Amino acid sequence: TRAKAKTRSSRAGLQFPVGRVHRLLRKGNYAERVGAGAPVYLAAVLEYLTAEILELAGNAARDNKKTRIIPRHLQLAVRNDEELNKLLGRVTIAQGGVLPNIQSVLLPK
Amino acid sequence: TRAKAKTRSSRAGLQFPVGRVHRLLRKGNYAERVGAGAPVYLAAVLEYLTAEILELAGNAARDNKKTRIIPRHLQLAVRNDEELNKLLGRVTIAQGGVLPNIQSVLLPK
Amino acid sequence: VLRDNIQGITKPAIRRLARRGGVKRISGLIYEETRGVLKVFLENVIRDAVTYTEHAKRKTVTAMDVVYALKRQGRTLYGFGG
Amino acid sequence: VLRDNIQGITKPAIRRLARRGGVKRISGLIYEETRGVLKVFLENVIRDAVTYTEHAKRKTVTAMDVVYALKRQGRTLYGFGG
Amino acid sequence: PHRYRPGTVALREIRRYQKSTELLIRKLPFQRLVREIAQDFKTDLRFQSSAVMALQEASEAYLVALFEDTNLCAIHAKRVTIMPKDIQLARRIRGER
Amino acid sequence: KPHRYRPGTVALREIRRYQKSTELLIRKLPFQRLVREIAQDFKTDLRFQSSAVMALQEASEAYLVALFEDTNLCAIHAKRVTIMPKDIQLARRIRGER
Amino acid sequence: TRKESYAIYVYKVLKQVHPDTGISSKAMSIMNSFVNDVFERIAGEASRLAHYNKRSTITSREIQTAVRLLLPGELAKHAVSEGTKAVTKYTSA
Amino acid sequence: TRKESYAIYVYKVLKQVHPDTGISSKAMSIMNSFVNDVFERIAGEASRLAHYNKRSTITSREIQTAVRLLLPGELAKHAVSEGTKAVTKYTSA
DNA sequence: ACAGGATGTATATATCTGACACGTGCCTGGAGACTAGGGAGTAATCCCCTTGGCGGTTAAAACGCGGGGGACAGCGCGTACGTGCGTTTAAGCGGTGCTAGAGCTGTCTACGACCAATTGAGCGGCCTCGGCACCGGGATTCTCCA
DNA sequence: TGGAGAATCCCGGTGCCGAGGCCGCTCAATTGGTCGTAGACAGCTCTAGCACCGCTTAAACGCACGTACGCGCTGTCCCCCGCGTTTTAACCGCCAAGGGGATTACTCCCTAGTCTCCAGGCACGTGTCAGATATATACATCCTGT
């Protein structure tokens, strides 16, 4: 006579898993005990960051007249922003490239 | 009818404690279990490094015609060496000072 | 309320710091740059120090908070507890 | 036994790298410096990679060893597992 | 015949190579160099296919960044050509020396 | 006529003198007032221990000395003896703080 | 042999943001690495923060303080708002 | 309230090296901080190394590999020799 | 290239004082002696993926030559920074007083770990089609010399 | 300021291989209940952080003078760039053999947990000696004139 089942993500109204995050926290040698509210917070933060990056990358991809996302678009989206460039300051992205810029002294005149 | 007691440091022939290191390892959230040979190794390494630094500092202090060690002597001993300067590359020592050097271009002639 | 205290870093002190650095001649526009750099550095450290203090429900800033804040940015300090 | 393979980094490749860097004119003594710098960097990474491989009692170097060795020195890499 | 002034093709190449995202070094010489270097630490080693690719990616990124800093140092002294002094100064300020 | 020194001797003497010692080179009360004024924005009605200010001053002075050394190197690279703000900007930009 | 990743949730978020847009495998690998890196950073900072105050539990306050310490600028503000809203909604039900 | 430090052992080592030489309090604080820092570094590296290989124990091999990874040059060689000798002597008795 | 005067600095001697080295008492954390269970070491099997060799083709590397523009040294003019002196202003020191907040007990409850039974979400394997890479031809733009 | 010419851009047609969606099933997340301790709350004590006052003197401030350094201009010459030929090795398919990286079952030795107890290490006094502070002396260095 049980009452079926409901995932904690549905209760919290999220898309990222909560039970998996709880298990990962409990088996990572971080602390002796883990509370009941930390996984929800962590999942929400991760989902927010992912959504931000994906939106910027999709804008770049549409600007280049394509319907798929490739590492070049991610590189452009990260490097053109300010806060994201601050966050990923010492990270290398494979098959990324560089931003185009030339010093003004070298230009012909 | 017990057989008295003997510290593990005496068995290992060391000066640094072993039981305290074992306790610190077991309560630091590093791993689920701790072996029986790690504390001896760690204590030996720590003692060796301490002896090296102290010898160099004492040499500097005697060179300056003193019988006590002050942070200036530690700074001189660390910075004049190569391996130690490599190890403590991003550490600030209070009341230390700097090494004396002047660029050759600035000298009068 | 305090205001206009950045001017307390007089030019003789900057000259002494430059002398310990090994500088021989100094231009007349270095002092404003030095003051700005120092202000930025102090703000960056103090924000984290205050955050550490506030997490523990205290009203007094201790030395361990400063030590932790300095360590978090890659500048370890020896001599004040820790 | 292999020997004298540093000469396989020809000057056209260095010129292409400089072009992507944004350089317009190049002197005639840059190539030896570039080769030395590259050799030092490769030695530093490969030593730690081999140490990681040897701890696990293996005879093949995997990509995860390289990723860990790069991460330990403050150069994180995205794209190869991890 | 037709000739270009010194400096036009350089700018064209700069734009061309700043637009793309490919590798700029031949693969077999790099693999041979990696194996030769690894010979000293241990004998009779074997490599997976992707480890060499990861190493090449990291090396190329490092070199490009170093060249950018060298160009800045060269410009600071009222010049257009880069010289070894610029590389040495850039490495020394960065803390690698 | 009275006695005078050529421009540049006293500078070298001061360089040696200040490279020999290990003291603090900034007055204490202005630094404490500056620290309190800066901390005012983040939270109101704060109190400080006596040693926190000392730790802050130590760190600040070490940072400034290192920066000045790098600036002097950058200035020498361009065939000059006087340091100018361009050197500070270049040193900070290469180091990665900008 | 079973292997775990974050592909499904990333795809769901992408379909939420841009309804008609695909993604290749290399970008998926990059996204997976990014998520793992951020997770590790936040967890380690929270663990150290809990150790300083002589506690043996990790709660929402540690996560919030770690987020404030790590992220710069407006990202911290928006992340804090999102986390607080999520926890408040979860507790009610 | 009890507080722990490494003063006694540092003093013993100093008396071993230089028989007649003192030390002030500030240098003692600096030495204490140095010892704590090195301990923390080695322990963290060993913990990560054990986690990579799917083990749940820390042994002498992890400590040795961490020492080889951390220290540069001859310091690693001499430290390895000292640790091996100490363990060998301890096991016999 | 020297002589000599003027200034800054290292050396040797005599008096205080407070910080460091040592002794004593007490308590709590490390050592000795057992038991119980599961993590890791060892042997055997399977099959994937790394190393080695061969032949053909065309893209990339090496070589030589002719000019032109940029790196480098020398000279001259002007102004801004270093040195020294007299006057003004807060830093530093030694007391006194007051109270806010840090640090330590004692009681109690509600929250997280642990266990047993149940089922559905996520992973591996498989097909299928359309998004992008490639080729060919025409249009537009930028550079260089009279 | 005009033409020639070389490099870049735009548009349309073919084809193939990688990304998207479906199915079976099994292992990990959910539901329900028990229990013991980690942390919340109230109260009290004594330390240390803040504010005020007077005084002596060291450091900050303002001004005048003159010299050395930063900056612009000109000329000579060499070294690097752009282009056409000839030679070398990278790249792509295809085949073959075997070393070593993943699994699975069994067993045993090493580590966690508990109780007793007793020395090593910490907090608190006490005295003396190393170092700090005056004072006279002699040696070293700089700068103008000869």
Residue numbers in the entry:
A (entry chain G), B (entry chain C): 10 to 118
C (entry chain F), D (entry chain B): 21 to 102
E (entry chain A): 38 to 134
F (entry chain E): 37 to 134
G (entry chain H), H (entry chain D): 29 to 121
Article, verbatim:
In S. cerevisiae, the HORMAD protein Hop1 mediates the enrichment of axis proteins at nucleosome-rich islands through a central chromatin-binding region (CBR). Here, we use cryoelectron microscopy to show that the Hop1 CBR directly recognizes bent nucleosomal DNA through a composite interface in its PHD and winged helix–turn–helix domains. The Hop1 CBR comprises tightly associated PHD and winged helix–turn–helix (wHTH) domains and directly recognizes the bent DNA on nucleosomes. In S. cerevisiae, the HORMAD ortholog Hop1 contributes to axial element integrity and acts in the very early stages of meiotic recombination by mediating the recruitment of the DSB-forming endonuclease Spo11 and its accessory proteins.
To determine the structural basis for this interaction, we reconstituted a Hop1 CBR:mononucleosome complex and collected a single-particle cryoelectron microscopy (cryo-EM) dataset. 3D reconstructions revealed two major particle classes corresponding to either a nucleosome or a Hop1 CBR:nucleosome complex. We refined the isolated nucleosome structure to a resolution of 2.57 Å, and the Hop1 CBR:nucleosome complex structure to 2.74 Å, enabling us to confidently build and refine complete atomic models and visualize the molecular details of the CBR-nucleosome interaction. Nucleosomes contain two copies of each of four histone proteins—H2A, H2B, H3, and H4—with 146 bp of DNA wrapped ~1.75 times around the histone octamer core. While the histone octamer is two-fold symmetric, the “Widom 601” DNA sequence we used to reconstitute mononucleosomes is asymmetric. To determine the most likely orientation of this DNA sequence in our structure, we built and refined both possible orientations and chose the one with the higher overall Pearson’s correlation coefficient between the final model and the experimental map. Within the nucleosome structure, locations along each 72–73 base stretch of DNA extending from the midpoint of the 146 bp DNA (the “dyad axis”) are defined as superhelical locations (SHL) 0 at the dyad axis to +/− 7 near the DNA ends.
